[PDB]
Design an enzyme around this catalytic site. Structure first.
Site, short mmCIF file in Angstrom:
data_model
loop_
_atom_site.label_atom_id
_atom_site.label_comp_id
_atom_site.label_asym_id
_atom_site.label_seq_id
_atom_site.Cartn_x
_atom_site.Cartn_y
_atom_site.Cartn_z
N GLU A 101 0.83 -1.21 0.00
CA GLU A 101 0.00 0.00 0.00
C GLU A 101 0.86 1.26 0.00
OE1 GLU A 101 -4.43 -0.36 0.01
OE2 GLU A 101 -2.80 0.95 -0.67
N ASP A 102 1.63 1.41 -1.08
CA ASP A 102 2.34 2.66 -1.37
C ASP A 102 3.43 2.92 -0.34
OD1 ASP A 102 0.41 2.97 -3.46
OD2 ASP A 102 -0.94 3.93 -2.02
N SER A 103 4.29 1.93 -0.13
CA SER A 103 5.40 2.03 0.79
C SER A 103 6.60 1.38 0.14
CB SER A 103 5.07 1.38 2.13
OG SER A 103 6.16 1.51 3.03
#
Ligand SMILES: [Zn+2]
Ligand SMILES: [Zn+2]
Ligand SMILES: [Zn+2]
Lengths: 117, 1131, 101, 101
Positions: free
Chosen positions: B759-761
């Protein structure tokens, strides 16, 4: 039928309004500024074209053939001069629903013939 | 002679480089300011009327010439010295130059006793100077000279320094003036409205808008009205025509209808004539206008005079404001009515509000001119009062004492300092957001802020039409760069080759049209206007012509030869409607294009040859423009242009698309702006991703400017090891991203590894971070000054003492010196003191007012600067230095909208490795790609692998058919790698191969300003606000987090009543009041003596204690302030 | 009713200059015109003068409890910013009810 | 909903002093076929005529006839507004109105 144009007085150059002469039972066009009167020649006072059956060929001008952004075609020669090339374009005018119709104009200079297929 | 396709990609970019060698990226700002100083100030001073004052003797005081010296600074001794911009930045001065005006006062009393006294160079004000402008001390200096002055040679300039703060004027959009625009509002009494914001050539008043509308159908027909200025009632157009001296209906329709063979126009104008027949002479019409006005004179004489003055001055000033211009005004108002009828008859299209051909960009020059007009008018007013109070006594006066120069100086300084664009008194009618603080976070942010445009539609407006990316923004505004918050589509950015016109006078063009076969408008008969072509110049219908085609040919030849017509003049021939509109005014956004012959470019190979040796034979961009090979085309002239996207379009094809092109793109990639020109392969991304990167390139760390060692910026981030991208576009060569890059090439692996990048990490390499990977330094400047404002109380820098100072915190002051200032190299932790300032009292005779560190920083003092501010007390700036090593929670981004925070950091032995022991610097999750469709990220990774293995820099220019994925894959397969960029990786923990071959390679990543350490915050019973005893707001105030209405609603849905009461009563503002059980109003309690009494009821026994929020007590008291009786009845 | 000092706290700036609340400045105007009207009724004043004074007192009280009256001029202060009346203190978002309760 | 405009092709006002010899040439057949018998008060006739031309397409698209139209006109305006019309056979769907007095 055709439309009816405005006509002006010969003295005050104001518009002539319609009036009826009971004595002769005849249409007159009289100025409400001066005291001029005229014998009408059309007998029609008002015309409304609800259908708006306007010949858009009259709205076109030959100068549009000088537009570099218009498309040109060699497939529709001119009936008036025989030039091969011609610009074409759509109506793009409001109050015209069936406006996919194409209007052609001859690109020959000083001919400027306009038509429609 | 012809440039062949194989050479084209060089030739075009050679041409582009020449442009940026000539102009730069902030040319619009500098040219605007230069025109304002060279022309606008002088025009404003001369356009002011001479102030004739007399009791007798009389004085005129005519201002005749201006002189703007170079920027100087006056010390307390008064010695003028040349002030350098860096000295202004450091000392919090204003980089301004003095404006002196020549004044001529002639004494005229009687008997031809005349004598003139001229005051040469009367100091009229101080004008702030845009940096790198002609009137800047950094003008024409070499890079060595700029470095000698502690200036960055890459600094573009284009901004002002007001009180040490770098301020940048944002170009403001506005509807163009002197042009008739026929719109149609769906919800209004009018069917069609034709407006014209009219403004004289040399501005002296606001835009006078005139409307000419048609009343919506439903007396008999459709009536045409005219909403004149300064008149609060609609006026029939025929009345206006008669008030201008055209009483006969024939004359009025001669002016309105140019083709008498057209009864449709005639019947549509007839209702207006029928409605105006009782009024038939000029005086009666003027009386009607005056009566409909908002100041109806009881006597018709002054009514007629007022109507005369309105119809001569406020109605259509651009047509002419002098007398005997009624013919031109009548022709123009008839043209407005004609345009309205053409729209109502469907013969013309309604005008598009969003078309940028209909808009103008109000730049620094024309904005400073608006300020200067207002301020000079106020100055002349003050001079009038001052001189009047002296000549009323019958004696001479000194104009030097009449001129209070603070008007112009403080006005310009205030307006540029705050951004409130207008007089300081009208601080709410003024429009803010002009003149923002220049963004100095990275070089791209500075360039973009200097190329920023603004649509002042209002962020509150929820109509999407002005926010939409209009078709006409092509080549003028970046399609991608725009804020994604509440100002989508309103704040814009120039495209790279976009040039905003600076303005020019139409005099040479009008003179040539006179010498040419144009016929003036007063000399013609209206019968000629039918077949003839109208000619407008800056909105004014000046005449008519018979062969518009060869007129346009002549004018285009003249502009391409740099003859009387300058390059920025727009010349649009509308063919279907026979107008020829010529524009010379300022604010017209345009762009350069290659002119095209029959089907060939005029840019032959000889031009490319001379451009290649640009540095020897001084053959520049201007020689390319003067050769008639390049042309600036504005948004409105693009409508008449047929563009070729590339010279390949000019090739004869099996089916010719156009075969009559007129221009060609220099390169399509120039449609992008500064921040979108850094995206590699932006045509392989979803467009929202390109917009998000264009926003995120501005928060990326790098080296924002070369001379960062000398700047005392409030906040500054410098990356330890900036790298130029391995995969670059050919536009960054002009953005100077290669000289001041804002990222690092990271070996990024797109993989699912341990789940810490979901999730966007991202998962970063701890070993790489140990080696200086994405390490930065954070510089924070604290300013302080000791004020000796009066003998009542004076501040002073000195090491405080526990025995004399009163408000002295428990923090130790040992790090300070006897001067009260900390020394460089001293390690300072949170809450520490850096400046020891003490203020004399009226813990005796001095109180501690020391400057602490912003809490929880823990830096080292980088340097300390001491100087004197403008007024001249001691002034200190302390720059503290804090090394920011990337960590979990720090935000990173690629150039494709792929942002994410560091989830975890693994050491090199914990990261996955290739057969040759390469570990990824970053690991990002594959799930960030599919929905986003950032294929440019993958192509950039593959191109970067090829570039690193080949020893080159990849070409990721957007539209390049010589670079596709198959070529890059074939190249990569030559270096012993899987052609698609995959590799077998091994698990770092176990060493086993990963079943799925991972996609890994160099990608340019950016470290963004948003570090977690600047965001983490906690509170447990800290300070509270004064008014309502609730926690403060902000990290800096040690404030509490807001438990808002939505949180209240969520906890109500949960049913958690005690938690809701804890959050909204006990953790915010618990309080107690004493209420009278009879009247329910808060009583008087005395808990020390235990005496509770209500003065209202005169009781002291029936009082009750009530536990309520302090905000509720404050509410009830503010209601009692309003005579409301909120009675808290406990029974 | 003039509210207590808690409703209109006089916050001390960095130095010793005590800044007063908008309500306090407005109450100062109200007391000024009230005393002025009291003396003008007690001593020599024209009827139109007393009428103008009453009009100004009405304006001050109305703009103390509600500053955004349509048509009327906004109660001004130093720096050209309008005063925050009791109504704006609790009118909507960021007022007492929604913003503090 | 269908108004007379939705089905009308074009309207015009003429000055016809005697209906026997009409201004238009193609409307002389049915006007005399209507006038040879006195159906209305010929004395209460005005020389101002209002000729409206319909279009077959919109007439057929609504299954409408001149009978229904004339009935609707003579109902909305009573006998004060005389209307006459031909059959639904001519190449042009035309109907003529006059004002009664
Ligand atoms: Zn007449
Ligand atoms: Zn032809
Ligand atoms: Zn009580």
């Amino acid at each position: 039928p055709g439309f009816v144009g405005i006509r002006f007085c010969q003295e005050c150059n104001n518009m002539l309004y319609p009036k009826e002469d009971k004595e002769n039972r005849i249409l007159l066009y009289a100025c409400r500024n001066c005291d001029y009167q005229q014998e009408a020649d059309n007998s029609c006072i008002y015309v409304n074209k609800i259908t708006h059956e306007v010949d858009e060929l009259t709205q076109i001008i030959a100068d549009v053939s000088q537009d570099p952004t218009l498309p040109r075609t060699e497939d529709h020669p001119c009936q008036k001069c025989g030039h091969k090339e011609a610009v074409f374009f759509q109506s793009h005018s409001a109050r015209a629903e069936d406006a996919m119709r194409l209007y052609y104009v001859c690109t020959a200079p000083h001919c400027g013939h306009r038509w429609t297929e | 002679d012809e440039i062949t396709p194989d050479l084209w990609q060089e030739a075009c970019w050679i041409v582009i480089s020449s442009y940026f060698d000539e102009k730069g990226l902030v040319r619009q700002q500098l040219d605007s300011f230069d025109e304002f100083i060279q022309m606008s100030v002088q025009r404003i001073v001369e356009d002011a009327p001479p102030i004739d004052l007399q009791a007798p003797p009389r004085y005129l005081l005519k201002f005749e010439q201006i002189y703007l010296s170079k920027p100087t600074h006056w010390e307390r001794d008064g010695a003028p010295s040349p002030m350098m911009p860096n000295e202004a930045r450091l000392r919090n001065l204003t980089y301004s130059a003095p404006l002196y005006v020549d004044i001529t006062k002639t004494v005229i009393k009687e008997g031809e006793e005349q004598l003139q006294t001229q005051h040469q160079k009367t100091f009229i004000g101080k004008i702030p100077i845009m940096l790198r402008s002609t009137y800047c001390l950094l003008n024409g200096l070499t890079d060595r000279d700029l470095c000698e002055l502690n200036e960055c040679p890459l600094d573009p300039g284009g901004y002002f320094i007001i009180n040490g703060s770098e301020k940048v004027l944002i170009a403001q959009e506005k509807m163009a003036t002197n042009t008739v625009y026929v719109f149609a509002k769906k919800d209004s009494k009018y069917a069609y409205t034709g407006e014209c914001r009219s403004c004289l050539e040399n501005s002296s008043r606001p835009t006078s808008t005139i409307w000419v509308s048609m009343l919506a159908r439903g007396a008999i027909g459709q009536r045409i009205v005219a909403t004149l200025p300064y008149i609060k009632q609609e006026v029939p157009i025929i009345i206006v025509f008669r008030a201008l001296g055209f009483v006969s209906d024939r004359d009025i329709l001669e002016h309105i209808i140019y083709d008498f063979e057209d009864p449709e126009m005639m019947e549509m104008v007839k209702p207006s004539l029928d409605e105006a027949f009782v009024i038939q002479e000029q005086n009666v019409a003027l009386n009607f206008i005056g009566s409909r006005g908002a100041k109806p004179g009881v006597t018709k004489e002054k009514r007629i005079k007022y109507a005369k003055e309105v119809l001569q001055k406020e109605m259509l000033p651009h047509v002419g404001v002098s007398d005997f211009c009624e013919t031109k005004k009548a022709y123009f108002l008839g043209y407005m009515v004609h345009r309205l009828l053409l729209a109502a008859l469907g013969r013309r299209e309604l005008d598009d509000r969003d078309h940028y051909g209909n808009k103008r960009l109000d730049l620094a020059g024309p904005l400073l001119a608006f300020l200067f007009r207002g301020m000079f008018k106020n100055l002349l007013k003050e001079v009038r009062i001052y001189a009047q109070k002296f000549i009323d006594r019958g004696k001479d006066f000194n104009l030097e004492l009449a001129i209070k120069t603070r008007i112009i100086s403080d006005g310009l300084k205030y307006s540029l300092a705050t951004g409130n664009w207008g007089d300081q008194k009208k601080a709410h009618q003024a429009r803010a957001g002009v003149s923002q603080v220049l963004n100095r976070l990275t070089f791209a942010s500075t360039l973009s802020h200097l190329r920023r445009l603004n649509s002042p539609i209002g962020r509150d407006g929820k109509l999407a039409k002005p926010r939409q990316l209009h078709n006409t923004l092509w080549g003028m505004v970046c399609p991608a760069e725009t804020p994604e918050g509440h100002a989508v589509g309103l704040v814009k950015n120039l495209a790279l080759m976009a040039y905003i016109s600076v303005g020019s006078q139409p005099s040479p063009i009008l003179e040539f049209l006179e010498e040419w076969s144009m016929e003036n408008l007063e000399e013609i008969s209206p019968a000629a206007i039918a077949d003839a072509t109208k000619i407008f110049v800056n909105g004014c219908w000046v005449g008519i012509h018979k062969d518009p085609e060869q007129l346009m040919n002549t004018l285009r030849k003249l502009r391409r030869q740099m003859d009387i017509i300058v390059s920025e003049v727009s010349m649009i021939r509308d063919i279907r409607e026979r107008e020829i509109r010529i524009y010379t005014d300022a604010g017209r956004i345009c762009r350069p294009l290659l002119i095209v012959e029959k089907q060939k470019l005029l840019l032959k190979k000889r031009h490319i040859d001379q451009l290649k040796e640009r540095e020897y034979n001084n053959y520049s961009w201007q020689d390319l423009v003067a050769s008639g090979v390049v042309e600036y085309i504005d948004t409105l002239e693009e409508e008449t242009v047929m563009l070729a996207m590339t010279p390949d379009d000019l090739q004869e094809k099996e089916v010719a698309y156009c075969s009559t092109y007129t221009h060609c793109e220099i390169h399509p990639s120039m449609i992008l702006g500064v921040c979108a020109s850094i995206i590699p392969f932006p045509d392989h991304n979803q467009s929202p991703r390109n917009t998000y990167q264009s926003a995120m390139g501005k928060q990326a760390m790098g080296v924002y400017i070369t001379n960062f060692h000398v700047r005392m910026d409030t906040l500054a981030h410098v990356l330890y090891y900036p790298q130029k991208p391995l995969v670059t576009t050919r536009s960054m060569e002009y953005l100077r991203f290669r000289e001041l890059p804002a990222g690092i090439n990271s070996i990024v692996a797109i993989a699912s590894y341990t789940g810490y990048n979901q999730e966007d990490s991202v998962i970063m390499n701890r070993s790489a971070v140990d080696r200086g990977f994405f390490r930065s330094v954070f510089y924070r400047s604290y300013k302080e000054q000791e004020s000796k404002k009066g003998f009542d109380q004076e501040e002073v820098f000195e090491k405080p003492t526990r025995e004399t100072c009163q408000g002295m915190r428990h923090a130790i002051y040992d790090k300070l010196d006897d001067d009260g200032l900390i020394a460089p190299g001293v390690r300072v932790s949170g809450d520490d003191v850096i400046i020891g300032k003490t203020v004399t009292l009226p813990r005796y005779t001095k109180r501690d007012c020391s400057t602490f560190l912003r809490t929880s920083e823990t830096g080292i003092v980088d340097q300390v600067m001491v100087t004197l501010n403008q007024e001249g007390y001691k002034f200190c700036k302390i720059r503290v230095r804090s090394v920011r090593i990337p960590q979990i929670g720090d935000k990173f981004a690629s150039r494709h909208g792929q942002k994410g925070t560091c989830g975890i950091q693994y050491r090199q032995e914990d990261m996955p490795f290739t057969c040759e022991g390469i570990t990824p610097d970053i690991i990002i999750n594959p799930h960030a790609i599919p929905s986003r469709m950032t294929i440019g990220h993958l192509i950039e990774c593959l191109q970067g692998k090829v570039s690193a293995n080949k020893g080159e820099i990849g070409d990721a220019t957007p539209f390049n058919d010589a670079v596709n994925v198959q070529k890059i894959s074939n190249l990569l397969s030559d270096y012993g790698y899987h052609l698609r960029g995959n590799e077998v990786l091994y698990n770092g923990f176990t060493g086993r191969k990963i079943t799925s071959q991972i996609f890994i390679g160099p990608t340019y990543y950016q470290r963004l300003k948003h570090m977690v350490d600047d965001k983490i915050h906690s509170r447990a019973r800290g300070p509270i606000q004064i008014l309502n005893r609730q926690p403060m707001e902000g990290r800096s105030r040690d404030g509490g987090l807001r438990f808002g209405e939505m949180e209240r609603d969520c906890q109500i849905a949960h049913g958690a009543a005690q938690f809701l009461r804890e959050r909204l009563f006990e953790a915010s503002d618990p309080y107690q009041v004493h209420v009278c059980n009879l009247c329910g109003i808060m009583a008087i309690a005395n808990t020390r003596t235990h005496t509770y009494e209500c003065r209202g009821c005169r009781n002291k026994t029936q009082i009750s204690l009530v536990r309520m929020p302090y905000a509720c007590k404050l509410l009830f008291q503010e209601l009692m302030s309003m005579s409301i009786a909120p009675r808290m009845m406990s029974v | 009713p003039v509210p207590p000092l808690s409703v209109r706290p006089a916050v001390v700036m960095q130095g010793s200059a005590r800044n007063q609340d908008d309500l306090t400045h407005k109450l100062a105007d109200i007391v000024k015109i009230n005393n002025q009207l009291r003396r003008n009724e007690q001593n020599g004043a024209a009827a139109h003068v007393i009428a103008e004074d009453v009009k100004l007192l009405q304006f001050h009280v109305a703009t103390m409890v509600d500053n955004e009256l349509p048509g009327l001029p906004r109660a001004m202060q130093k720096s050209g910013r309008p005063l925050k009346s009791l109504k704006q203190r609790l009118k909507g978002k960021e007022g007492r009810v929604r913003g503090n309760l | 909903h269908t108004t007379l405009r939705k089905v009308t092709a074009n309207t015009a006002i003429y000055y016809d002093p005697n209906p026997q010899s009409t201004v238009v040439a193609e409307d002389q057949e049915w006007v005399n076929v209507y006038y040879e018998m006195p159906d209305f008060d010929v004395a209460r006739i005005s020389p101002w005529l209002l000729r409206v031309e319909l279009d077959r397409k919109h007439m057929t698209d609504r299954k409408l006839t001149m009978e229904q139209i004339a009935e609707k006109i003579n109902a909305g305006f009573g006998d004060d507004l005389n209307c006459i019309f031909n059959d639904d056979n001519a190449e042009k769907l035309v109907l003529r109105i006059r004002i009664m007095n």
